[PDB]
């Protein structure tokens, strides 16, 4: 019925607000990115600091792992993405082509492609091996908040402050679907469900929503949190109970029962907006990170 997530570790060291935390697919590591221009690597279980990864010239808003937990891509205000080899710390490629801050990024499930969204209102698809831009999508009319690939990589989901979520054919770059509901709030986050049937989408009106994007229908609504200013990640938690996990601008982490949409827990301790959360791929471990007045990461376990 309900989770029992308790604070285990508080990770410190980013010198400015944290923007993103992500667990590696193999469950060994946690990567964080930050407005301090740095990427940091922590042990997923003991929170033990591993290394710092640097090279971006301005703050980073997102970081993402390749399927094999070997590479990272980061999206920065310096208008680049960078492909990092985690074990050697090398910047392998610097993807240039966006005309404004790069906000979000993800590998496809094969880690041969990267998708990015930017304040320049485009979605771009990059080749991992050459670091070149394969397509630019004129996706939105306002800044793009989130970009995600589906289970086979055949589709890409986009989110923007223009109020739309869009689905794209990865091979053609064609828009296959535009989702919006009865109000048009800025869409601040989007991602596919692990089975690839649904998109979970956040809007700046304090609302998360589960969509069946084929049927074009909102299935579930998750409310209770505070989310009007910032692009807060949300997650499907599947290692124990089937939850929805999201930060909040009231400094708490919210956990919903996915089916019944009830708040089943709130996690307390950050001293600022909880901007990013992440769910461990095989343990009941939640990572959370907060903004300028906190600068810490926290590992909770149930």
């Amino acid at each position: 019925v309900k989770p029992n997530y308790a604070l285990k570790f508080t990770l410190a060291g980013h010198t400015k607000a944290v923007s993103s935390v992500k667990f590696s697919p193999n469950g060994e590591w946690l990567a964080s990115s930050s407005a301090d221009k740095l990427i940091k690597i922590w042990g997923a279980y003991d929170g033990k600091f591993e290394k710092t990864i640097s090279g971006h010239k301005l703050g980073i808003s997102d970081v993402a792992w390749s399927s094999d937990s070997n590479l990272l891509v980061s999206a920065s205000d310096d208008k680049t993405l960078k492909i990092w080899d985690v074990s050697s710390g090398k910047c392998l490629k610097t993807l240039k082509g966006h005309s404004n801050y790069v906000f979000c990024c993800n590998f496809n499930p094969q880690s041969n492609l990267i998708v990015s969204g930017s304040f320049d209102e485009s979605v771009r698809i990059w080749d991992v091996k050459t670091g070149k831009c394969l397509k630019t999508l004129p996706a939105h009319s306002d800044p793009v908040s989130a970009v995600h690939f589906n289970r086979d990589g055949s589709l890409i989901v986009s989110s923007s402050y223009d109020g739309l979520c869009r689905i794209w054919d990865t091979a053609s770059g064609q828009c296959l679907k535009t989702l919006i509901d009865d109000d048009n709030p800025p869409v601040s986050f989007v991602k596919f469900s692990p089975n690839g049937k649904y998109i979970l989408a956040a809007t700046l009106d304090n609302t998360l929503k589960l969509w069946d994007y084929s049927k074009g229908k909102c299935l579930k609504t998750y409310t209770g949190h505070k989310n009007e200013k910032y692009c807060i990640f949300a997650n499907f938690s599947v290692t124990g109970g089937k939850w929805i996990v999201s930060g909040s601008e009231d400094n708490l982490v919210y956990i919903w029962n996915l089916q019944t949409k009830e708040i089943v827990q709130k996690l307390q301790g950050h001293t600022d907006v909880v901007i990013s959360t992440a769910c461990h791929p095989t343990e009941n471990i939640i990572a959370s990170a907060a903004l300028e007045n906190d600068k810490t990461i926290k590992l909770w376990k149930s």
Partner: peptide, 5 residues
């Protein structure tokens, strides 16, 4: 920019 309102 994610850390900014």
């Amino acid at each position: 920019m994610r850390t900014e309102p």
